Each structure stands twice: as C-alpha cells, then as structure tokens.
A and B are shown apart, each in its own frame.
Chain A
Amino acid sequence: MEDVEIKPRGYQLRLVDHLTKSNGIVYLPTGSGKTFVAILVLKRFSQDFDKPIESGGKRALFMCNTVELARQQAMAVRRCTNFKVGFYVGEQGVDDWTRGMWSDEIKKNQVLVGTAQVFLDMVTQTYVALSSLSVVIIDECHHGTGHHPFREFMRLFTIANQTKLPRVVGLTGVLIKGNEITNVATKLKELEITYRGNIITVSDTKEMENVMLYATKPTEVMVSFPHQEQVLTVTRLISAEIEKFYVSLDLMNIGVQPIRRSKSLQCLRDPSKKSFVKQLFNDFLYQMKEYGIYAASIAIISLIVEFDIKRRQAETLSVKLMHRTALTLCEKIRHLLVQKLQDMTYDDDDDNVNTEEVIMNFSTPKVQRFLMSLKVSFADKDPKDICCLVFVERRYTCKCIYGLLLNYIQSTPELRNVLTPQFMVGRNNISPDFESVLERKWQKSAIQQFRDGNANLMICSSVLEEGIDVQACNHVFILDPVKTFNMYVQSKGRARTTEAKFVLFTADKEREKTIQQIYQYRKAHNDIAEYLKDRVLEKTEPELYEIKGHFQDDIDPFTNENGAVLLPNNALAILHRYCQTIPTDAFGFVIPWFHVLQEDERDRIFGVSAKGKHVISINMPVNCMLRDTIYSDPMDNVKTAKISAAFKACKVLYSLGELNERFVPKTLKERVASIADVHFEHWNKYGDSVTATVNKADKSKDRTYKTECPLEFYDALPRVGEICYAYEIFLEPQFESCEYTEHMYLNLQTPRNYAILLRNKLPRLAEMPLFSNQGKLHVRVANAPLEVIIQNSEQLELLHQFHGMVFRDILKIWHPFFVLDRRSKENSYLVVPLILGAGEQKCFDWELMTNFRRLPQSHGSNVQQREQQPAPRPEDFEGKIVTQWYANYDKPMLVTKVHRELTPLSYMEKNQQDKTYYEFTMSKYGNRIGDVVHKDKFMIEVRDLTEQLTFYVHNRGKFNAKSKAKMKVILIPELCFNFNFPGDLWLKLIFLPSILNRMYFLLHAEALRKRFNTYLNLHLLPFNGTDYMPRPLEIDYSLKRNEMNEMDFEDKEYWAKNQFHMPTGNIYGNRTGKVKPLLILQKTVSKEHITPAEQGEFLAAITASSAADVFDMERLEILGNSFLKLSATLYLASKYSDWNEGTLTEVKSKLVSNRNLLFCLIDADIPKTLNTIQFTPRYTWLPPGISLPHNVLALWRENPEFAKIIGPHNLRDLALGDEESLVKGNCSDINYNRFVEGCRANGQSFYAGADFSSEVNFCVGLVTIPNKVIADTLEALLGVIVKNYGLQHAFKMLEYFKICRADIDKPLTQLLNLELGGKKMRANVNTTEIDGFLINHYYLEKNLGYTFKDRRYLLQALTHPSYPTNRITGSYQELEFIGNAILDFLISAYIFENNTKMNPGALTDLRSALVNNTTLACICVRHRLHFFILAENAKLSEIISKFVNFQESQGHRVTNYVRILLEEADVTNVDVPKALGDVLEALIAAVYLDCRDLQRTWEVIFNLFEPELQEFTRKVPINHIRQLVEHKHAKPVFSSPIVEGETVMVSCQFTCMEKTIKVYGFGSNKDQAKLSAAKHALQQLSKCDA
C-alpha cells in the first residue's frame, strides 16, 4: 500500500531551482545538461523583456570566451526559447557605433550573446545600465582569474548600485584549468569571491558519477618501461632527403609573383601556395617521431591528395614541374614506408608466430609492453567479463593504433575469441570505414555497439574522456603522456569499477620527472574532494526529508464520518499516488512542489504567531482540480512543516471528493459509478449496465426486431360500399427511343396503367428512379387520388383474385404455403388496372379482370387441331402475350409486331436466306407438332422478357451481337399459344415489385420526416407542411456499385524576424485569401438559409448498405458521428468542468459507444422500420395480398419453443390447393396435422439444431440486424438534421434521443454552443503578468492568424502541466478536450459538404488522416508555435527538439515517408510527443472561446489546414489496406488478427528480411499491431539502407 517515489525530481531541475533562489556557481563534469540548465535559468528570469528600458525593461547577457561557444549558445537559445537573440562578437563592426543605436538594438533584442571585449566596451564607455539587466550567465567561468576580462566584468559590479545588480551564474565543467594545481583552497576561495556565489555540484549516487568519482579507487601502478632517445636510420635518411630537396628548393627560378608578408611583420616569408609544402613536410616530420610509419604513410597519402587538389588549382608550368618533383619525393617516401611495412612483418618462415613477433618488434617499447601485458592478461580469460579501452592524445593516433591492433588481433587467433578492436575520432574526419562517414553517426553506432556488449576495446583521443556514461571498464589504457589534471581525473573516473586495475605508461627516464607530478595530481584530487564535501549540495538541501522522522506527537491524524484514520505519515505517499491517477503524457508523473517560505514573507502572511517557525507551501500541479497553493501551519522544523502541509492538502482533496471514504484516489470505474444513474439510465431495462464487466466475446452482435408496415398500408384493404382511393403509377422512360428499346419505350407511355387501391389517403411521394435492362426509368405516383366506390362484394372478390393472379402467374412469386390475405392487416393494399373511362377520368377496367381470374394453362396443339380449328384472326395477336409451347412451355412471349406480308413459305430474313420458315421449322422440329397447316398466313415478330425483378442496378448486360440476335425472333402464329393479355400492361406489371418495395420505405421516410419536423417546431414553415413538394431521389454515383559566418549573417535578418518567421518562400503545391463559409455554419446563425428536409435524404438514412440500393446510408453517418462527438464533448465540458481530462474523455467515449446508441435507439421505436435486407422477391418477399395460412401463423405466434424448429422443407410439406389458397384461407385439418407431425421429425433427423430462422424470418415479420447498423442509423439521422437545419436546431434533437439529459432548471441544451471554459471570474487579475508569461505573443498571434481580445486563454492553452510558475490558469488539456471536437466537426462538415466525388467510406479515412495526432504535430511545428509552450521536463525537451529537427529536415513536407510509419512510436522509444500535437487543439479551442464566432474559428482552421486539405484530398493516405498491399511487392505473408479480449486486443504475425525471418507483433488496438509491423518493416529497410 506504500508505493515508493524515491525523489524522482531531476538534478537539473533541482539545480535550476537553486539558481533562481540565489546566486551561485554550478560545476558539472558531464558535458551534457549545462545547456539545458542555462536555458531554464534564462527562462526563469525572462519576464519583463517586452517592457522598454526607460519604463523598467531588462535584458539578459551571455558570455563565452570563444566565438564558436557563443554561436552554439545562440543556436541553442533560438531552438529552445521564444526570445529575440543577439550575437555580438569581436570586431563585427560593433565598436564603431553610437549610443542611440545601442539603445535601439537593446529595444530590438532581448537576450544578447557576446564575448568579453564587446561587453567591456559596452559597459565602460557606452554604459548600459547594469541595473537594467535581468540575468548575466557565463560559460567556462574558470577561465576568469587575475587580469582575465571576466574578473574585470565582475569587478565592475562593485561600482554600480549594489541594490539593483543582476543575477550572475557561472557554468563550468572543470574547476581548475588542469595544467598545474597548487594551493587549491586559495584558488577556490578566489573563485568564490570573483563571482558573488558558491560552487554547487550534484552528489547523486544513481546516474551521475560524482560520488563514485571520490568514493572509489583502483590499484595504481606504472609499467615503468625503459626508453631512450628515439633514433632511426630511416628517419635520418628522410632528414637527408629533405635537406637535399631544400638545398635545391632555393632556386625555383619561377616567374614573378606578389610578395607575401607576415601579419606580425617580423620577416619576409614565402606565400601560402609555396609554403604549404614546407608546412606539410614539417607536420610529417613531427608525426614520424610521435605516430610511427603507418600513420606516416596515411598522412603522406592525404598530403598527396591535397597536393593533387592544389596542382589542379595551380596553372603555372614551372610551378607544376616543381610540384611534380615534390610529388615524386612524397611518392618515394610513401613507397619506402610501404616497402618497410610489407617486408619486415613477414621476414621469417613460421608465419603463425612471426606475424606476432614482428608486431612485438614493430611497436615502440611502450607499445611492446602494452601488447605483451594484454597478451598475458587475456591468455585464458573468458570474454564474458572483460572490457578495456585505449586513451591517446591525437585523432590520427586512434586510426594508427587501430591498424596496429587489427594486425595484432588477426595475428593471434586466441585473443580473437576474447578481443575486438575499434577506433574513434572527432574533428578533422578521415575515412574510418565503409559506413557512417559522418562523425556523429559513427560515434552513435560506436556507443550503441559498445554498450550492447558486442565489442570490448576501442581507441579514442580523449573523445570518451569528456564524461560519457559508457560501461565502466575494468582496466584503462593510456598510451600518450598524461600531463594534464582534468583528463587524468576523468580517465581515473573511467576506472570506477571496484577492485579494478590501472596502469601508467611512463619511461624510466621520464619516471623521476613524473612521480612528483602524479603526487601533486593525486593530492589535489583529494583536496578538491574534501573542499566540495562540505559545500551545501543537493543532498544537504531539504529535498532529502523522505526519511519521515518520528514526530507524530505534535501532529494529529484525521477521521471522517466513515471512521477511516488518515495518518499524516502516509500523506506524501497518498498525494503521490493521487498524482499518479491524473492523466499524463507518459513523461513521468508530476510531483507537487514544496517551496520553502522566507522569514519576511512568513511574517507578511502570518506575523508574530509564526516567529521562530518554518512554513512550506505546496504547488499542486495545474492538472489536478486544486489550483491554489496551500500553506502549512507553523511549527519548529522543516520536516514537520512538510508533513503538516501534505496532511492539510490531503484533507482538502478529500473534502472536495477526489478521494473516496478509504482515503485512496478514485479510479475511472469508481467515477463512472456516479454517472450511471444520470446519463446511462436507459441501459437498465435491457439487462445491461455501464459497468461493462465483460466485453468482446460475450457480446452478441445480432438482434431480431418485428418489422412494421407504414400506417398508410396497415388496414388499407378497400371495403364494399365505401370510398376508395386509386393512385395511378406513371413510368417515364429516360432512355432514347432506339429500335432496340422501341418495344420497351413505346409500351411504357400507353394510357393503360395500374393503380394502388387504398382505404387510406397517401401523401406526396418523390420521383422513383428505376433501372431496367434497356435504361433508366423514372416513376412517379399520381398526387391526386382517383376516388372510386366499390359497388358490390363480387367486384371486390374479382379485384383480389386479379391481384393474386398477377403475382401467381405473371410474376410467379408463389410458394405452396401462400394464401390470399383476405383479412385486413398489414400490407393490405391492392394493385388495380386502369382504363380510359368516360371523358378524361379513368375508370376500373372490369373487362380484363373479369376474363383473367387465372391465366389459362399453356396448352399445346396436335396437328389434328389446326386442320380442324379455324385460324385466328391477325388482329387478335397485336400487342398480346403468346407462348412457344413446343419449345418452352412456361416462357411468356411478348408480341411487338404483326407481319401480314410474310408467309411460312418465305425465306430467312438474313444470314440463312437459303432457308424458308417451313423447312427451318421442320428441320429443327417436326416431332410432337406434325407439319404446319396454314402455309400462307401471317407471321409475328416477338421480343423476349427479362426475368429480373430487382431493378436497382445501374450496370447493364446488353450486347451488340445480342442486339441483332434478338430482333430476329419470328414465330408462326398458330404454333404458339396466346393468353390474349395486353402486352403493355404485362410489361408495366413486371416492374411492380421494385416499385412497391421502394415505396414501402418511402412512406416510412415521409412519416419520420413529419415527426422530426413536428418536434423541431418547423412544420408551420412554408417550406414544410402541406405545401411541401418532395424532390426526386438522388443517385449516389460515388458508390462503387453504381568559418561559416556567411550563413549566420544571412540568418541575422531572420533573427530580427526571429524563429517565428514563417518562410512562405515556396508553396506546398510545389512538391511535384477569402475563405468560403460553411453552409451549415451560414444557416446556423441566420434562418434565411433553412433548407426543407427532403424525404429522399431520410430514405437514404434508413436504407443500410446491406441492401443493393443505389444510395447508401454511410455518407450521412460520418457527419452524424462528428456532430454527436462535438455535442457530447461540449455538453460534458459545460456540465462538468472541474474534472480532469481523462475521465471526461472516458465518459465521452462511453456516451458515443455503439451500445449506448443502440440502446437509446431501441426505445425510440425507429429500427423496426429499417431497410437492411437485399430485396430478393422470389424467395424472401411477402406480397401484400399474399400471406401464410391463419391457423399456421396462430400456432407460430404461440409456441416459441416450437416456432424455433419450423423449417422450409416443412413449409413445402404443406400442400395447398386452389380452394384452400383462395376461398377458405386457413389450411385444411388433414394438412395441418401432416405438417405438425412432419415438422417434429426434424429432431429425429440431421436437420435438428439448424438455423431455420435465417431462412424463414420473412414469413413471420422478423429480421436480424447487426448492432453496428442501429448506431449508424442514429448517426445518419443526426447528420441529415444537421445538414438541413444547422447546429442551432440540431443541438436540441439529442434531447429527443435522450442522449443528453435535459436540464430542468434552464433550457441550456440549446445555448450550449456558447458555454464558457470553466473558472473565469477568479482569474480577473492584472494582465501585466499574463503578458509577462506571454513573451512575444504578437508573433504567435500573427502566425496563428488571430489576435486575442483576452490573452488569458492563450496562456492557458500554452501551459504544460510540468510548469510551476503559472498559477492563474489551468493546464492545456482542458482546452484540448474541447478543441478536439471543434476541429473534428469543422473538418468533417467541410469535407462532407465540399467533397462529393469521393467514395463514402474513404471520407472516413480522410477524416482520420486530417485529425491524426502526427498531422497535428506537423502543423504545429511547421508554423513554429512550439517555442511558446511553457514546460519544465528534460526528456520531453530533447524529444521535442529531435522531432523538430526531423520535421525541418524535410521542409515540413507531409508527403508520406517515415513519420507516418513512426505513428506507432506515439504515446523502440517514442519519437513524437502528444503534447506537441495537443497544444494546437488547445489553441484552436482558445481561438473559438475568445470570439465565440464559429465562422472566424473556421477561418483560422482553414488557413492552418489549407495545404494538407489540398494534398490529402488529391491522394488520401490510408493505413489498413496500405499495410496490406504495400508489403506484397516482395512480402505477401500475413496472418489473421488474434482477438485477446484483455489489455491488449489483437496480435499479428508477419515475416522480416523479405521472407526468411519471421517476426510477430502485438497490439492494444486494431491498428497498433499494423503500425508495429510497419516499424519493423522500416527497420528492415534501414538494414537494407545500411
């Protein structure tokens, strides 16, 4: 229960906190971290930069001994801080200026960087007020002693006003210069006096090596190798050759050249082009005595290359000849060196031993002892626990020793099993290897491979002696002379391993002159240790009060009504645990500050009562709902003050409900338990709860609902003797009247039609788009109902029997169990043909329906019948339906023409003109028909009829060869049987099922539109109401099935423009003004643009994508989802503002969950009228007048345990005759029995336990709809209302869906669009300090393109939770929460309204790409808004800096590449921070809140997102199919998603190294595994790249 928090606050933060308290000097041997502490100490004193000097403005000063140091400091300050920076070094035209422009530039620049001379010139004679300075930090302060200019600058502090002096701190990596150290105490006291502060140095025992630098020591010996003055006959020969070259190098007799003189004018000297060879020869002479001959050879090779470059630069022929002679001499020297190298090493026979012996002879005696000692050290030692490292002094010596050690290690195979060589260099880079030429990457691979344990030896020229954290070598190699204190001490620190060994490489002649040296070095090290031991370091600071001393006597615990005891000892632990509960960026938790109060402030706030006592204040981080500080009551000691402060803070936290009765911080599950009865109440009646104990597998994703017909269709059977309404149906052919479509085209325009007879009036319906085989059809229902009266019951019976006959015979939608639905129930409407009656008023066509109660059987005819039966008249066949009985009995065949001019004796029309009709018929037939009787009569041209019944497909299957093949259909009239049915009426009836199916849902859409408009109080509008003209349905064609000072000088002007200067030199359109307002936003404020709600939109919102309809419901789903998300976010932010971001986000996710939407739509009674099943009419459709037997349905509806075993085979077991199916209705008792005992046999058969419901649901009125479709339906309805009436009206409709609870006290669910951001009245403090925090906010607002009326919102949006100084505003997470929804909706509405050609479903991917956190970070960095984030966290600092460098390397391009693969590395270490992306959302929310103008907020957002909105719409990046199809170029191997149902949801398997290496990943979300696979593929590509 006692979680440990072992002082996690960083030493850098502690040092900076100490520096702001008082003056001091900080000393850190570690090379890194001094820049960060300098940046923080600059930022702490950074306010009051904007104010002018005359009104009390202050500036900051940087001091560096060398100009390169100043340049690096300036670069770091630019990259890390949002302050204008100057750079004034040496004689850059600064001393020739005037006082007025000094003042002007002090106006221009805030922080000014320079060296000592410029600053002494500035202060002494062009005096700028030292009192007008904020902070003066200096670097390598140990340089300043005696007459050093740092001493003078510090002495000037004694003349000016000592009560207004600025703060001075001196950074240093070494306390002493390291040359020679005597009288350590005197020098350190002098350094203490020079800068008015103490030396502070961390003593952490965890990762800093400070304490181990003095608490440990290895054994100390020297090799004591003998050595004399170096002499070599080859060196003598080289000297003689150089002398021979020089005695002739005085007679070049070259042409006249300009005279070159030395800077000091001591004597005349040769020009550089002539003395370069002399300088290189002198360097090589120096090198041979120090390096050897292999390094001499490589150096002379470099000299040869430089000579070649210079000769290419040279032009004179005599100079070319002299240079060629010099090149010949250098080549001869190189040849001699390489000859010696290749000859001495193998001058014996026994290669295996001589290869090592020569190296023991090649090496100098020091290196000889080195090699033999290493040999005897690794004679048999295991390579598991051995590691050492070589220190040298020269960069080239690293490579030389590397070559020597390579030759040595390859010579001895025994050490190859234990020893591995490397070599490392810094400046003046030479080719080290075949990879990573750059020094930085070479050293990075160096450190990673060494720390990974792959290698155990390298050579560095004091490169790693700077204080690198490499593995502690058990032994240290120092070949070069060690006459320097600092590098000696750091080298000894490299030997921190306990009981380790260290050797010294000193000659015998050198020993007597270095033993005393090592003596003062060691005693000075000890003296420095004992001098720093008594300083007030971090450990001695009150930060080490975690020991919790026993002082419980004078402090009391707390108990509540629950009786739980709150022990004050556990206060720190429970506060830390609570700080763990609040959301964080995973960059470590935030620990409350414990700043100690000064005695003067203590008396100011308390007075005499606190005299002699200590009090502490806790700065609860802005993330927690506590924002004000807490002051501890006074008592004696600091530890008890901290305990009392923590106890009081815990009491306050409990008082406000962040802790339960058990005094433990609450969790999300505990918090949502307080919201279940307020928001998620409706879940109770369905057996579910918001607790969600189990998920995933236990969820059932299918449910069955009882479909219901529209109220117009219910009880719509016409009566007898009562008025009845007939709505004529018109079919408009939109295709051109081609000859191929002539029969289709002409027959659709005939006056004869059929009408839907209803007992209830029908509303106006939209125009119906249909697609026949020939082309598109337009269908509309007559607006005016043709009222009629039924005379007698027999007329009604004839109507109903004709209705049954049409379906049974013409359409053949029949099953053995169908019976006429005589009773008045759902879908009781009828279809009645219409004919032209008296006048222009059409009347019922009783003649046809009297003679066509049932189609006559397709009777054949023997040859006897024709010769005895009279031939039919030619006019009887015009526009009728015939049947070629002798070839296809059941095929109905349509007559389109009569040919009185053709006889059976006539020949073929085409392609077989040698054949006549008679002989053709008698050759392909003749059996079962005899011959033809009338060989002289007429003929018929007939055209086929399609068997399709679903006409919701745009695509066609017409073929040209088929087009000629079709019109050649010619038949003998007496050999075919005609029904005497009008062809036009038949061809119109063939479209009846699709029309009825679409109208069945058009009625539902109309009723739902009426209800929605009635609720929204817009029904009285002229657009709506009885005057509404529905627009024709729209086809969704989008659906698939339808030095370098020049650079710094040219950067100086940009420094005047600051880092904030957005380049804008080239538009992002080159990779290869006024903004248009949103229509929804436009109609949100003004009612002039309120478009009427079309019923076509609602019908589109009803029909799911499962059906094959021409329009889909998914497109509205995106807008509805985004609007619902925004509304939930704003509603929760307004209702609960004290909550932290985590619980708000969780509750928002819970409100928009699919389960919540489904449960809040089920009680809305909406899903029972959805179109979500493909319309196959021949198998899964119930015609209106057609139904199951009444007894069968009565038994069905009463025995569910029996209703779950009825099967389709048992349904065809029913044998219904015409009598049962027509008159009686109910099934016969015998058949009812046979069925009931036949169906029960399924249990005794293999059919037992099958899924009968999925095949017989249509017979009952049930349907299975997946859980996703219901939520999609609610979202689509939301989206269509938003699109039509705008946000201002669509906000209050969520009250209808009871998603958002209506507040009885105030109708605020309408005004929620203008709610504030939380606590604002308590922050009306003076704006001067707000401006102080917001340094250079003008440039931030300019880049963001919006000037803030109130700067408070900007400060809140820029406040990272790891920032203690801010105390008036909350963190940025609260604003980011709102900004997320604001941006999401403002981008979703834009893409939905503006992009229509884009495929629905791809819009979702586009929206995800736009809202992606990596994209947000890219936008934020591109506009350089990151400089203004107020944070104090190191690891976040370098991660942000690295991400900024990576972004700028690409020019802020958003063209795919690598960071989209690094998307996995969001919150292999992280490479993109969430705070950087989220600050943009916070800024967007601040922009909206300041102005309350959605249109202006859209202006800002569009101006931000214009380039990526252009690019992404052009080609949208995708994730899932992207990772599916990009790998298959050479890696088609994949795996199924393994669902886990735990903290991690999914796992995936894949292969690396193209195919031969199998690597698998895991994922806490669906795409997490794919992104992990993407990063593994990226790493493989890096291996391919490497």
Chain B
Amino acid sequence: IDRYEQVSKDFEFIKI
C-alpha cells in the first residue's frame, strides 16, 4: 500500500 503503519515518538528500544 506504500503507506505501511505510522509510528511516532511512542517507541521503545527494548533490551535483548
């Protein structure tokens, strides 16, 4: 769809 999913500053770099 070339739109994918919109994501914002509510992101996490979670530990392995």
Contacts and interface: CB of A to CB of B under 8 A. Distances in A.
B3 to A, nearest CB: 6
Given A220-B15, A503-B13, A362 B2 contact: yes
A361 B3 contact: yes
A234 interface: yes
B4 A221 contact: no
A625 to B, nearest CB: 64
A365 B4 contact: yes
A368 B8 CA distance: 10
B11 A222 contact: no
A369 B12 CA distance: 10
Contacts of B15: 220-221
Interface string A324-365: 000000000000000010001000000000000000011111
Contacts of A234: 2
Contacts, number: 46
Contacts of B13: 221-224, 503
B8 to A, nearest CB: 8
A406 B12 CA distance: 27
A518 B16 CA distance: 9
Contact of B7 (A231, A232, A233, A369): A369
If over half of B's interface residues share one DSSP class (helix, strand or loop), that class is named, otherwise mixed; here it is loop
Given A222-B16, A518-B16, A369 B11 contact: yes
Nearest to A220: B16
Contacts of A232: 1-2
A361 B4 contact: yes
A1578 interface: no
Contacts of B14: 221-222, 224
Contact of A231 (B1, B5, B9, B12): B1
B4 A344 contact: no
Interface string A369-389: 100110010000000000000
Contacts of A231: 1
Contacts of A224: 12-14
Interface residues of A, number: 27
A290 B1 CA distance: 15
Interface in A478-522: 503-504, 515, 518
Contacts of B11: 223, 369, 372-373
Interface string A198-237: 0000000000000000000000111111100001111000
B12 A365 contact: no
A221 B12 CA distance: 10
Contacts of A515: 16
Contact of A368 (B1, B7, B12): B7
Contacts of B16: 220-222, 504, 515, 518
A376 B7 CA distance: 14
A340 B3 CA distance: 13
A365 B5 CA distance: 7
Contacts of A365: 4-5, 7
A1036 B14 CA distance: 93
Contact of B5 (A226, A233, A373): A226
Contacts of A504: 16
A221 B9 CA distance: 17
B16 to A, nearest CB: 5
Interface string A227-263: 0000111100000000000000000000000000000
Given A221-B14, A221-B15, A222-B16, A344 B7 contact: no
Max chain A Cβ within 10 angstroms of own Cβ: one of B1, B2, B12: B2
A482 to B, nearest CB: 12
Contacts of B4: 361, 363-365, 368
Nearest to A344: B2
A730 to B, nearest CB: 113
A365 B13 CA distance: 15
A362 B16 CA distance: 29
A372 B1 contact: no
A500 to B, nearest CB: 14
B4 to A, nearest CB: 5
Nearest to A519: B16
A558 to B, nearest CB: 63
Contacts of A503: 13
B3 A233 contact: no
A880 to B, nearest CB: 121
Contacts of B2: 232, 234, 340, 344, 361-362
Contacts of A225: 7
B11 to A, nearest CB: 7
Contacts of B9: 376
A504 B16 CA distance: 9
Nearest to B2: A232
A368 B14 CA distance: 17
Contacts of A518: 16
Interface string A802-829: 0000000000000000000000000000
Nearest to A228: B5
A522 to B, nearest CB: 8
Nearest to B4: A365
A340 B2 CA distance: 10
Contacts of A340: 2
A220 B4 CA distance: 26
A359 to B, nearest CB: 12
A341 to B, nearest CB: 11
A222 B13 CA distance: 6
Residue from B1, B12, B13, B16 whose CB has the most chain A CB atoms within 10 Å = B16
B12 A233 contact: no
Nearest to A366: B4
A235 to B, nearest CB: 10
Nearest to A221: B13
A609 B12 CA distance: 73
B7 A372 contact: yes
Contacts of A364: 4
A231 to B, nearest CB: 7
A225 B4 CA distance: 12
Interface string A907-918: 000000000000
Nearest to A515: B16
Interface string A1109-1131: 00000000000000000000000
A368 B7 CA distance: 8
B10 to A, nearest CB: 11
A518 to B, nearest CB: 6
Contacts of A233: 1
B14 to A, nearest CB: 5
A342 to B, nearest CB: 14
Nearest to B1: A232
A227 to B, nearest CB: 8
Interface of B: 1-7, 9, 11-16
14 contacts: A221-B15, A221-B16, A222-B13, A223-B11, A223-B13, A224-B12, A361-B3, A361-B6, A363-B4, A368-B4, A369-B11, A372-B7, A376-B9, A518-B16
Q: List the 5 closest A-B pairs by CB distance, nearest first.
A: A221-B13, A365-B4, A220-B16, A224-B14, A221-B15
Interface of A: 220-226, 231-234, 340, 344, 361-365, 368-369, 372-373, 376, 503-504, 515, 518
Given A364-B4, A368-B4, 6 more contacts: A222-B13, A225-B7, A363-B4, A365-B5, A368-B7, A373-B11
